[PDB]
Design a protein around this ligand. Structure first.
Ligand code: HEM
Ligand code: HEM
Ligand SMILES: ClCCc1ccccc1
Lengths: 145, 145
C-alpha cells in the first residue's frame, strides 16, 4: 500500500531528502523550471501531456510553464514537510495522485521524473545516494498510481 | 485586471500578510481544516462542489479533506513567497485560478472564503486589519476568475 511505501522511508533517507531539499528547494522557480525543461528534453514523448502550458520550449519566459513549475515545487515542499507523519504524507500523496490519475499518467510514466531529478541534483553536486533517496519518495507516489 | 489587483498589495498590506502567516502557517493541518470546516458550516451551499471529498462533516477524520486542506495551505504559502515579484505572483495565481474555473467557481463564490478567513483569524487574535489584508490577496485571485 501507499502507507507501506511511506512507512519504509528511514531516518537516513529522510535526512538525505531534507539535506538536498534545503538547497534545491531554496530556488523553486529556477530549479522547478530546470526540472520541467529537462523532462521535456530527455522525454520528448511527454510534451503532448502539457498542451495547456503552450510552447514549453520558451522556458522561463512562458508564464504558464513558470507558474506550473513553481507550484510543482510546493507539492514537493508539502511532501518533505510531512515526512515524519506517514498518515499526513499518505493523504497528501493520494490527493496529488488523483491529479495525475485524471490525466491518465501511469506509475511507470510518473517514474520518468527520476531522470530529471538525478540531473538537477547532480547540478548541485548531490550524487547517486541522494538520487536514490528521491527515487524512494517518488515510489510512494507510484504506489498510489 | 489581475495586474491592477496585484498592484494593490502595498508595503503595509504585504507586511500584515507576512506577519499573520507566520502564525497561522505554523499549523497548516489544523488551520487548513479549520478554514474548510468553517466554510462548509457557514456556507452550506458550497458543499456540493466538494463531492469528491466525501462526507466533509467528518472534518479531520476525513482523509481526503485533510489532504485537501493541507495542500490548500501550501497554495497560500506559494502566494506569500511570491509577494516580492508581481510577475511571479500573477503566474501562480492564474495557475490556481484555472483549477477553480474548471470547477465552475466564480469570483463571487470564491469570495465567500473571506468570511471563514476573518473568523479563524479572529480566533487567533488577529482582527479586521489582517482580515482586510487577506481580502486584498483573495481579490487578486478573484480578478483571474
Ligand atoms: C516529482 C514529480 C511530480 C510532481 C511533484 C508533479 C506535480 C504536479 C502538480 C502540483 C500539478 C498540478 C495539478 C493540478 O493543478 O491539477 C501537476 C500537473 C500535471 N502533471 Fe505532474 N508532477 C510530477 C511528475 C509528473 C510526470 C512525470 C508527468 C508526466 C509524465 C506529469 C504530468 C502532469 C500533467 C499532464 C499535469 C497537468 C498539467 C496541466 O495541464 O496544467 N507530472 N503535476
Ligand atoms: C483561500 C482560498 C482558496 C484556496 C487557497 C484554495 C485552494 C485550492 C487548491 C490548492 C485546490 C486543489 C486544486 C486541484 O488539485 O485541482 C483547490 C480545489 C478546489 N477548490 Fe479551492 N481554494 C480556495 C477557495 C475556494 C472556494 C471559496 C471554493 C468554493 C466556493 C473553492 C472550490 C474548490 C473546489 C470545488 C476544488 C476541487 C476539490 C476536489 O474535488 O478535489 N475553493 N482549491
Ligand atoms: Cl493568514 C491566514 C489565512 C488563514 C488561513 C486558514 C485559516 C485562517 C486564516
Amino acid at each position: 500500500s501507499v502507507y507501506d511505501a511511506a512507512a519504509q522511508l528511514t531516518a537516513d533517507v529522510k535526512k538525505d531528502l531534507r539535506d538536498s531539499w534545503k538547497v534545491i528547494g531554496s530556488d523553486k522557480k529556477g530549479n522547478g523550471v530546470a526540472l520541467m525543461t529537462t523532462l521535456f528534453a530527455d522525454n520528448q514523448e511527454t510534451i503532448g501531456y502539457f498542451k495547456r502550458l503552450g510552447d514549453v520550449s520558451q522556458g522561463m519566459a512562458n508564464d504558464k510553464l513558470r507558474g506550473h513549475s513553481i507550484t510543482l515545487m510546493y507539492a514537493l515542499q508539502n511532501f518533505i514537510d510531512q515526512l515524519d507523519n506517514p498518515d499526513d504524507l499518505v493523504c497528501v500523496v493520494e490527493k496529488f495522485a488523483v491529479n495525475h490519475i485524471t490525466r491518465k499518467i501511469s506509475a511507470a510514466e510518473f517514474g520518468k521524473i527520476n531522470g530529471p531529478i538525478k540531473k538537477v541534483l547532480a547540478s548541485k553536486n548531490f550524487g547517486d545516494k541522494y538520487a536514490n533517496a528521491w527515487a524512494k519518495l517518488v515510489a510512494v507516489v507510484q504506489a498510489a498510481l
